[PDB]
Design an enzyme around this catalytic site. Structure first.
Site, PDB file in Angstrom:
ATOM      1  N   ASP A  61       0.808  -1.226   0.000  1.00 14.54           N
ATOM      2  CA  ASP A  61       0.000   0.000   0.000  1.00 14.54           C
ATOM      3  C   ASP A  61       0.838   1.272   0.000  1.00 14.54           C
ATOM      4  OD1 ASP A  61      -2.356  -1.368  -0.135  1.00 14.54           O
ATOM      5  OD2 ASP A  61      -2.746  -1.287   2.034  1.00 14.54           O
ATOM      6  N   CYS A 164      21.004  -2.101  -9.327  1.00 12.42           N
ATOM      7  CA  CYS A 164      20.072  -1.044  -9.678  1.00 12.42           C
ATOM      8  C   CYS A 164      20.717   0.249 -10.145  1.00 12.42           C
ATOM      9  CB  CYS A 164      19.201  -0.623  -8.499  1.00 12.42           C
ATOM     10  SG  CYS A 164      17.942  -1.844  -8.128  1.00 12.42           S
ATOM     11  N   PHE A 215      10.015  -4.764  -7.031  1.00 10.86           N
ATOM     12  CA  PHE A 215      10.707  -4.995  -8.297  1.00 10.86           C
ATOM     13  C   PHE A 215       9.770  -5.551  -9.367  1.00 10.86           C
ATOM     14  CE2 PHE A 215      15.244  -4.248  -7.429  1.00 10.86           C
ATOM     15  CZ  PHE A 215      15.262  -4.130  -6.047  1.00 10.86           C
ATOM     16  N   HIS A 303      16.752   7.036  -9.791  1.00  8.43           N
ATOM     17  CA  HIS A 303      16.307   5.656  -9.706  1.00  8.43           C
ATOM     18  C   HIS A 303      15.349   5.490  -8.531  1.00  8.43           C
ATOM     19  CE1 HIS A 303      16.084   1.452 -10.218  1.00  8.43           C
ATOM     20  NE2 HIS A 303      16.439   1.232  -8.978  1.00  8.43           N
ATOM     21  N   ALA A 308      10.542   5.857  -0.630  1.00  2.52           N
ATOM     22  CA  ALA A 308      11.116   6.635   0.490  1.00  2.52           C
ATOM     23  C   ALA A 308      12.416   7.265   0.067  1.00  2.52           C
ATOM     24  CB  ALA A 308      11.291   5.713   1.682  1.00  2.52           C
ATOM     25  N   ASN A 336       9.966  -0.757  -9.665  1.00  3.27           N
ATOM     26  CA  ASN A 336      11.416  -0.635  -9.743  1.00  3.27           C
ATOM     27  C   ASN A 336      11.932  -1.689 -10.736  1.00  3.27           C
ATOM     28  OD1 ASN A 336      14.207  -0.951  -9.315  1.00  3.27           O
ATOM     29  ND2 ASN A 336      14.086  -1.011  -7.067  1.00  3.27           N
TER      30      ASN A 336
END
Lengths: 389, 389
Positions: A61, A164, A215, A303, A308, A336
């Site tokens: 959420d 990443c 991801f 990225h 957060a 992501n």
């Protein structure tokens, strides 16, 4: 007899490396985030982990992801219970998936980029392929060469198990390839498939579970070259300067080990905290030589490892909330996607800027910054200039 | 306001990428080839495979290898029977070995190279790490940064699962990094450890068995930079031109898959035949623009994947037998060390040329060629110029 200085002079390009095309692709299976905790706890046979499921629901959420595209389907998962466990021998099954899907998905994005570029694919001189899912010999670079019909003498750069931050890495690499070689046209492909990291939930590995909320899969392709042919090729963004660094006090912050049970994912430190503590240093290194210190006066690509990271960078720097719009739109619509994500954000930003008749591909601004974040903890910085209209 | 052309001009280097230092290292366990068939069939519990052992004895007798250095010891192998089987789940044990040994061995070679270079390690701006053994996140690049005390902002290039041609790949990459960036000093490390591919013998996989006769362990490190500081830095070889290609009619010739049982090794085609059929094309592309067509008039470095590659290239081109001396000396004393091998040959060649008072580091010749061969089948070409004395 022969003059190496003469050769060197004739061999190199003149202008800044330029992004000339961007194409993206994703698996056809669209997975809604709203209902993902129910789907995931059921498919992993974990419905009895009530407390854990509640935590995952909150994770999803708060993820600020609406949907993700996933190679993995219910049917594939039902045939691979070892992939559905938290830790079961499964690398061979996962490799069989992604050694094929990474180049298949990368090919779709690449064809779109080449179509946009509009020039003969035989003019591609260099190929960078980047993935964090799977490895093989010959690599995905060889496979995309074959699948696309590129020249056998394309110069290949196979970036495996990168993580990443490597959407910035591939730009940093493409810049030198393009700028040091007259005529060079670099096809850049980032292709990320979560089949190597998908695994079931365990209540003493909440960091692994975070990965399952965030991801998703995707590929992005670029054409990069110096000295674009005016009125034939079409500049979108220019690269001007790059850096890579390892944040202090971050040892072990983001790790991933490739094991008989697949690729594991660990978070041992506060990644939003470390990134926001170190992002100013990165910006001053990049922009104080350009005389700019107003970070709302540049366009942004970050990225989106998780929301957060973005919230804490926005707060640290007092970014207007709109600065992260393109970034957050990609997070919302795709999750992501590891190395490919930043390239999807570049595409989003230039498409909106042109569809809304702004004055540059960088939301009407001149200078911009692109950041990759990942294992290290590593920060990649790429300084960009937009193009008019 | 700001001028990107001005920035680009000030940002780039002038001269050809130059090798400024070479250091090598190997595991301390020296394994004699003469007695290796006895050792290997015993340690793999295969003494009953009499016919197969006879074939392996011939393989080793014809390998033209006197000894190899191996991380793996009798004691390590006795603790890891799954590594001693032909095909048993063992990747986790193998990864635990090489995620540590690849950077440990690479550090020894790197310290030697930096000592020879003689300049502050804080001046290293770029790091290329290359291996075919193991993968991890953060990678071996991160580890060597930490182990060597390099600057956190070193720009890293982590080349994983690359294969035997990548000694040329890393030179091809270092050339662009050095040449396009003023002041750049590239530390290049190739570090190869056969613990991921060691496995027991099977009589229906003679290609895998060939690997067991040929591959050994080693690391090599270089410093590469453009614009060397005269009388302070000391050029050894210059790079002038590079290429990579995929030989026709070679699909599947050399493959390697990373599985729960480790890294497999397959040979499905005649590799000496394919390399020798295609080496002339590579040479004419590299040297007809330099006006040279006498291939005995250049110095040679060839990846010694096995002795038959060298014998068939010598015969095809009518090389004098002495052309391959440095190459064959490294094969004899160390085996096929995958990506690192060509770098060991460069070291051998310049050390002999200087110890014997020849006029250049390239056996007294001006121009030279370095070839990598591996999965694809891929051929890397690097055109070199020697340095006087």
């Amino acid at each position: 007899m022969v003059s190496v200085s003469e050769i060197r002079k004739a061999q190199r390009a003149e202008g800044p490396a330029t992004i000339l095309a961007i194409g993206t692709a994703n698996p056809a299976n669209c997975v809604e985030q709203s209902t993902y905790p129910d789907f995931y706890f059921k498919i992993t046979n974990s419905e009895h982990k009530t407390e854990l499921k509640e935590k995952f629901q909150r994770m999803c959420d708060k993820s600020m992801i609406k949907r993700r595209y996933m190679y993995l389907t219910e049917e594939i998962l039902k045939e691979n219970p070892n992939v559905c466990e938290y830790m079961a021998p499964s690398l061979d099954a996962r490799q069989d998936m992604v050694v094929v899907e990474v180049p298949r998905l990368g090919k779709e994005a690449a064809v779109k980029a080449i179509k946009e570029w509009g020039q003969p694919k035989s003019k591609i001189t260099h190929l960078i392929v980047c993935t964090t899912s799977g490895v093989d010999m010959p690599g995905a670079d060889y496979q995309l060469t074959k699948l696309l019909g590129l020249r056998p003498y394309v110069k290949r750069y196979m970036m495996y198990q990168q993580g990443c931050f490597a959407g910035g890495t591939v730009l940093r690499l493409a810049k030198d390839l393009a700028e040091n070689n007259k005529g060079a046209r670099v096809l850049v492909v980032c292709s990320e498939v979560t089949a190597v990291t998908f695994r079931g939930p365990s209540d003493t590995h909440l960091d692994s579970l975070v990965g399952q909320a965030l991801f998703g899969d995707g590929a992005a392709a670029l054409i990069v070259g110096s000295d674009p042919v005016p009125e034939i090729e079409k500049p979108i963004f220019e690269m001007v300067w790059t850096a890579q660094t390892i944040a202090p006090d971050s040892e072990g912050a983001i790790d991933g080990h490739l094991r008989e049970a697949g690729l594991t994912f660990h978070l041992l430190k506060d990644v939003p905290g470390i990134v926001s503590k170190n992002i100013t240093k990165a910006l001053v290194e990049a922009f104080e030589p350009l005389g700019i210190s107003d970070y709302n006066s540049i366009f942004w690509i970050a990225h989106p490892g998780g929301p957060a990271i973005l919230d804490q960078v926005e707060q640290k720097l007092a970014l207007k909330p709109e600065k992260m719009n393109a970034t957050r739109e990609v997070l919302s619509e795709y999750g992501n996607m590891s190395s490919a994500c930043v390239l999807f954000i570049l595409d989003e930003m230039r498409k909106k800027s042109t569809q809304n008749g702004l004055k540059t591909t960088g939301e009407g601004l001149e200078w911009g910054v692109l950041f990759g974040f990942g294992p290290g903890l590593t920060i990649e910085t790429v300084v960009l200039r937009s193009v008019a209209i």
